[PDB]
Amino acid sequence: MTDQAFVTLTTNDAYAKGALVLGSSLKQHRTSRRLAVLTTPQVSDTMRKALEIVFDEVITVDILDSGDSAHLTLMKRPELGVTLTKLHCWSLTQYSKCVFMDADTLVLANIDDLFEREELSAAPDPGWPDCFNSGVFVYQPSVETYNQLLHVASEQGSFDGGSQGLLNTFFNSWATTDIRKHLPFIYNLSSISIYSYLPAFKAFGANAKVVHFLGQTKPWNYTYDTKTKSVRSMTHPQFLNVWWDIFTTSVVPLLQQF
Template identity: 55%
Template sequence: MNVTRVHDESYVTLATNENYALGALTLGQSLRNTNTNRRLTVLITTEVPQLLVDQLKSVYDFVELVDVLDSQDSANLALLKRPELGVTFTKLHCWRLTQYRKCVFLDSDCLVLHNVDDLFNSEEFSAVSDIGWPDCFNSGVFVFRPSLDTYSRLLDFAVSQGSFDGGDQGLLNAFYPNWNRLSFVYNMTTNASYSYAPAYKQFKNTVKIVHFIGAQKPWYHTYNLDTQNVIGNVTVHEGDLINQWWRVFTQWVLPHLNNETKNRMRVQLVSRTPLVEQQQSQLVQQQEQQGFHQEQPQEQVYATGKVVGGVEIGSDVHKQKWEHGQIEYTGRDAFANIQAHLDAQIKK
């Protein structure tokens, strides 16, 4: 569908590595699916592989390489138990996008469910209250005006005042004490410990932007292509939202990923469909060419506590191998073995 773009306004996101580039691709496509008439911009660092940069250029109107800004505030970040948030200071580069009159920033772990172009009617600085401390705003979604002067003052403030949480959220809340409060539907956090389940049930159809806060992002979950459901211990409403992320990803992003990227990304797919079978076959061929030996599937081999190939099924080591993409599609982790394990659990 052809949409006339408003060229002086843009949605902006940030991808600091290949996993968040995966999120940015899905976010960008979710925005496209709402028929937005604003431009899409993504800031990237050198940690994003060139193959993904090329794909980002097919979704975003403008892709800009930026330097990583680190808060170097290990003490405060330790309080959050999220030391990786230091690099989110790189988010400050979005104030340098002076080709735009106004922008809406979205973290790359967000998913847009309905058109939110009305956000551009809000002024700087507009954001949604943080559920952990509602007097503060969550910096995953906010409306701002790019300005080199503001960018300079933010950097000076960061150096002189720091951030009370070590990340961009603490810095921005201190810099913008008088902010305009937006409805929670523009930045609904999914973490089960934060969400108010009865309210979600009442208002879920009005939610416009979902924000997958916390360390466990949608792309770290295992997803069954056949049932279109996430596999794992998640609440009903959280699972529903993660499923929506995966549906956008599998329909619009996955088909365009090259094999090298698929194998590197933490994408966990379970399916009997030809697509995944083909991917598994290609992976096996690559491993055989590299001299790897894979054991053949054995009936009922996927049983918790059983040691296969030196790895105990269900152990932390096994989990880490899954999370790092070290999956034995034709051996320990073959679909037939997983299915046998699920069948055994159901019978219990």
């Protein structure tokens, strides 16, 4: 309850919008857990203040600062900035168990049952199913694990340049061990898989609990008509329209309070 949380991340104002929508969707579906978001100094004061209303806790991380434990590793592998910031999710020892969620995800139903899972639990990644998608995962905050993850980042880096490669390398038993650590795909439904593998989507898509907007084009990169309540041209904009309805209804007016 108080010791468990959903954790997201935002390094800029664009992803902050995503974080704000994600946070609102979690409250909308009455989560009994806390909401935390990792932010960087590059996030504007207005976005930061909005996040302070939506989330129960707003933590500030600055790996660009020499005082940060990940900085040394950043100098060695500068292309891993976002990934190194994301790893600080393991530094939140005020929580016994958390569910990390990318700022570009959207909750469509209560997913508190994820807290029954153990580290490391995640849904399979489309494209290479033997790797889990790092957009949504169940983990347990720990300084030891964090240090172990930093060590691997320093020595090996990430085979994909992001957090997915690093996490899959460290939590390498995922593909062959414990089916319970394989989160059902509907807990991290790739938006690409939706408009593509149409048959499978038509069959199981209605059970979606979380949508992950993976492409280059994020939800905030579209134009939304408030009158027709739909984005402008995608055979399935329904999810983009939900994202935008929350943004229009709860997020935008909240940003006007400042």
